[PDB]
Design a protein around this ligand. Sequence first.
Ligand SMILES: Clc1ccccc1Nc1ccnc(Nc2ccc(-c3nnn[nH]3)cc2)n1
Length: 263
Amino acid sequence: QWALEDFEIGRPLGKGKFGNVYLAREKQSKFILALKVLFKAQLEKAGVEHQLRREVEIQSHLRHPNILRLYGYFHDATRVYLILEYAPLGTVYRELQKLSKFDEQRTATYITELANALSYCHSKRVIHRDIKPENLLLGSAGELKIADFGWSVHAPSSRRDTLCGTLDYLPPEMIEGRMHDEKVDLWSLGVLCYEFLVGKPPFEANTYQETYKRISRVEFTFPDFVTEGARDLISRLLKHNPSQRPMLREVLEHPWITANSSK
Ligand SMILES: Clc1ccccc1Nc1ccnc(Nc2ccc(-c3nnn[nH]3)cc2)n1
């Protein structure tokens, strides 16, 4: 069983509330990875604990090119340690900060990786992955890996959406404190797709009340430059009624997806 001293530690890749993710490499094989460090006196108060340690078993069994792999974990006394696959390009979020908005080539391609990721997840009885741009990492050359998992680490940047970025990705069901089911995740794709193409989420607003309002009532529009197979796609992803949202495969089929993916 691994322990901290099997690792060299590099810079923090991100700092969240429960702890940091550090660039690390195992001492022998000199293999590079990411070491996620969770304080755990932090985890008490949030009421999150050994129920998460039953949970890490899940992400441990998930294997897929578009999902960040959790190689292993250990703890000591004061800290929990997740040994994760390292993603060299970082977050689609910084990238969107750089490019301001993406083009259709990448979007449909990112959208396809995502839909593949979640289809896999679903089949494992795993739903409601956090799909926000800051939780999405870029692997070796181009690939998209859902980082999800360990609760929201940031790499230094921004200060506009710090919070007020949260709400933008939640469908009505889930904010309305109704139940949530496996269709949640299809609403997210629609929010991503719009943000990839637009460089802002469909529902962005100055206040939480207003955002909430726009989500609840599905009030969002398109700048003119958005192509109309792209409208069709988004429009069909964001449906107040979950049941009117497609299964994941339709997404993959959708004639705009199939058209524009560099893959
Ligand atoms: Cl999910 C996440 C978001 C922000 C920061 C760190 C993480 N966690 C992980 C997990 C596995 N790999 C990585 N890779 C990574 C690589 C580079 C950077 C970065 N961008 N700009 N400066 N450093 C961030 C994360 N992050």
